[PDB]
Structure 1
Amino acid sequence: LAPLPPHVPEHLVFDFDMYNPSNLSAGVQEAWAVLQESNVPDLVWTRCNGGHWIATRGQLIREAYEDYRHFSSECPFIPREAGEAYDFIPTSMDPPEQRQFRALANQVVGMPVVDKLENRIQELACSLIESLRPQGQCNFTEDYAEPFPIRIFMLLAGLPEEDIPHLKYLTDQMTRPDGSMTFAEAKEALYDYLIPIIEQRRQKPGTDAISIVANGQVNGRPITSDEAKRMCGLLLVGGLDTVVNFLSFSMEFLAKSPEHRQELIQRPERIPAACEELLRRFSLVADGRILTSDYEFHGVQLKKGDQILLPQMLSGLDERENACPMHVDFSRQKVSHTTFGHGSHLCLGQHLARREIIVTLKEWLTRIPDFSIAPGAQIQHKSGIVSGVQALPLVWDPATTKAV
């Protein structure tokens, strides 16, 4: 626990640890939701992880993402040393400067590429599921959650699949560090990987995402090698540590809820709406901002340089935003969340992510309609900048499945 700063009143202290929350065994979203109990103020100070503010309600989270003059993306991660080393583009930049880089990132991960990759996304989902179908069991995180999104990103990026173990290790040290590497060390190893590839693709431009970023233009002028690396690094993290985790939270839920499986089996056209409700209930990201100057926000004095965690996960879990927020309702009329961000840094890979999710739900339920958590298993979650699932053993009777 770090020393309570003079300007922070004792009454706003709530020592929540975002990398190892106290109620983790009840589920990671349940763990973070203890910040929304009756007794907790809208804005708390935790002495964990060097000390920082935590906005616990959607209203505050949304408001702070909107106000980039007061809440800057220059230092967006806790701990402070990770935020300071963080220099990915466009996420480490505030408008106006940030905006020219979004258009180039959109070219490689936006709807354009989702349409280039439509056939391969569909084919890989169906192939991986058909291969598992006759087995009557799988380790979902290793057998589908990782390979499906990761192989698609490595295809898009023109990178060999043999590089996956190394890159997935490094990306995971930036979001759920095990202690072996600091953020700065993981980030520099990621750049060390990309440096030579970017120079080669600048000399001999190809069709892959690294070539397109490395030879791209930003508001009509050529991107620099340095800028290309800082954008590429960010795409590698997005590709290897977002959807990968979300798919396991969703499959864990479906394995525990036969009535929700039945609803999507009976009415497959509800899968897009089901995806959005699952994106709210199993929201999983939490980054934040740094105060650019002293500022009074919602009755609380904030000081220049103070870090504030604005958990994207928390907005849709707020009861003031959604009634009975821990219940999954595929017919929920107004599904409000900030799972993909809020403000000018809204996720650019959200269309790729929703396609991957929707394809997985549809193709899994077509072939393996009935499945459950392996008998006796207790599913364990992990927390960080992006939360996840440690392992997800599933079982089913092959006699209830069908080959397409």
Structure 2
Amino acid sequence: TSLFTTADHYHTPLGPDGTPHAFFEALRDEAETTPIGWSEAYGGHWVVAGYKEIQAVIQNTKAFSNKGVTFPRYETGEFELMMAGQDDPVHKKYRQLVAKPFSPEATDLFTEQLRQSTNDLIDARIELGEGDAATWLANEIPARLTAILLGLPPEDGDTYRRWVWAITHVENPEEGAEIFAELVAHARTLIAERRTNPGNDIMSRVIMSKIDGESLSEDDLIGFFTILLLGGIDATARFLSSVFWRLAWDIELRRRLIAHPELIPNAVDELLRFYGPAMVGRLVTQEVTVGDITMKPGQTAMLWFPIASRDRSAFDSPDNIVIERTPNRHLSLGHGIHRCLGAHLIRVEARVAITEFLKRIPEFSLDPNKECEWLMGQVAGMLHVPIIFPKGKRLSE
């Protein structure tokens, strides 16, 4: 009578609250006894839910390969996800090619440029009264910024989200391939129109790049593009979709942030722990024993962060958002050599998005006449969060 029996991450039961949190809180329980379980979904796999246990997997690079990070494998053809489906040396090497454009320093030069666009997207409907905080804001803030890093066309959110919708998987036959081939099409065009008349963007920074003293093949360039056009548009879009659905009803939290922004940065981390959409797996390359279980090479182990972010033997009162909690050592971004590449970037987007969104519309609420839809998968969160506020005034013209 275990929940691991049929544990499935693209299929987690949703409580009345609308979130699959009722499940986690409960499974979070079972793990105290059995920190790891075997699931019968997807041919057969391992579920790692204990904090001490998931933290033991991400660290032993020996027995676990990242060549199976997305699982079931992500729709990407004969292209491997850079610095993510590759183990070192490839990893250590490939990454140092974008290490700098992502450092806190370099990812600050866009700082007060995100407030503009945020505070400039709040003009879009601050005069209507409502709007899907997901589609309308959750999505555009992370999508526009990216476009700007990969030297891209700002208003095509729709097009990109369409590609990522196929990478991300839509349990569709191969139409994920038909559509991924277009990302590869545009990805190709963009590449070729950069090695001529460049820019300061990242996409460009890597072309001129060279490994071993020799440039790089486009099967690695079209490879990065994917990871990035996928790093900051999905996980983020969802995550934000969440804090907005969370601030729509958690008035105890809304009013508290509204009156103490010194905390917004900190409380942005407690939200990452509680609403982290990120979930990954590893691939077993050699017999190894974790805690009390033994895993033979060939099998995959899913690392259930949402569950290990609620382990009581690591977090005081885990089921409450404690905006003061310090330190916050969750794993919603992972640890080890695979520590999120855009780690500092979302702490920023959040800081702002939320900071500015509350100074503009300090009152709003879950639209009663439209129900919120939650996304599932290795990336989950709110997809549609329609709110209703007091029709206001915009700063724009």
TM-score normalised to structure 1 length: 0.89
User: In structure 1, which of residues 282, 285, 288 is the aligned counterpart of residue 278 of structure 2?
Assistant: 285
Cα displacement (A) at 1:367: 1.1
* Aligned position for 1:307: 300
Amino acid at match of 2:12: P
Q: Quickly say closer, same or farther: Cα 1:34–1:190, change in 2 above 3 A.
A: farther
Instruction: Determine if contact 2:75/2:180 at 8 Å carries over to the other structure.
Output: no
Instruction: Determine if contact 1:284/1:339 at 8 Å carries over to the other structure.
Output: yes
Distance in 2 of aligned mates of 1:351 and 1:205: 26
Distance in 1 of aligned mates of 2:74 and 2:169: 15
* Aligned position for 1:21: 12
User: In structure 2, which of residues 255, 259, 274 is the aligned counterpart of residue 262 of structure 1?
Assistant: 255
Instruction: Determine if contact 1:95/1:344 at 8 Å carries over to the other structure.
Output: no
Distance in 2 of aligned mates of 1:86 and 1:50: 24
Distance in 2 of aligned mates of 1:263 and 1:159: 38
* Aligned position for 1:7: none
User: In structure 1, which of residues 351, 354, 372 is the aligned counterpart of residue 347 of structure 2?
Assistant: 354
Large movers: runs of 4+ above 6 Å = 83-86
Cα deviation digits, residues 120-153 of structure 1 (max 9, x gap):
2121011112332232211111111111111111
Instruction: Determine if contact 2:278/2:305 at 8 Å carries over to the other structure.
Output: yes
Instruction: Determine if contact 2:98/2:202 at 8 Å carries over to the other structure.
Output: no
Unaligned runs of 5+ in 1: 1-9
1:313-332 correspondence to structure 2 within 5 Å:
313-332=306-325
Instruction: Determine if contact 1:290/1:305 at 8 Å carries over to the other structure.
Output: yes
User: In structure 2, which of residues 7, 22, 33 is the aligned counterpart of residue 30 of structure 1?
Assistant: 22
Q: How many residues align?
A: 394
User: In structure 1, which of residues 195, 200, 225 is the aligned counterpart of residue 193 of structure 2?
Assistant: 200
Instruction: Determine if contact 1:176/1:383 at 8 Å carries over to the other structure.
Output: no
User: In structure 2, which of residues 365, 376, 388 is the aligned counterpart of residue 395 of structure 1?
Assistant: 388
Cα deviation digits, residues 59-97 of structure 1 (max 9, x gap):
111110011111110111222576996711111112233
1:212 pairs with 2:200: no
Amino acid at match of 2:61: Y
1:1-400 correspondence to structure 2 within 5 Å:
14-23=5-14, 26-38=18-30, 41-79=34-72, 87-179=80-172, 181=174, 187-218=180-211, 221-398=214-391
Cα displacement (A) at 1:314: 2.7
**More displaced stretch, 169-178 vs 238-247:** 169-178
Instruction: Determine if contact 2:207/2:215 at 8 Å carries over to the other structure.
Output: no
Bigger share in helix? 1
Instruction: Determine if contact 1:264/1:271 at 8 Å carries over to the other structure.
Output: yes
Cα displacement (A) at 1:346: 0.6
Distance in 1 of aligned mates of 2:59 and 2:119: 40
Distance in 2 of aligned mates of 1:82 and 1:252: 30
Distance in 2 of aligned mates of 1:74 and 1:303: 16
Instruction: Determine if contact 1:89/1:234 at 8 Å carries over to the other structure.
Output: yes
Identity, in percent, stands at 26
Q: Quickly say closer, same or farther: Cα 1:190–1:30, change in 2 above 3 A.
A: farther
Cα displacement (A) at 1:370: 1.6
Distance in 2 of aligned mates of 1:353 and 1:151: 13
Distance in 1 of aligned mates of 2:150 and 2:271: 28
Distance in 2 of aligned mates of 1:75 and 1:86: 13
Unaligned runs of 5+ in 2: none
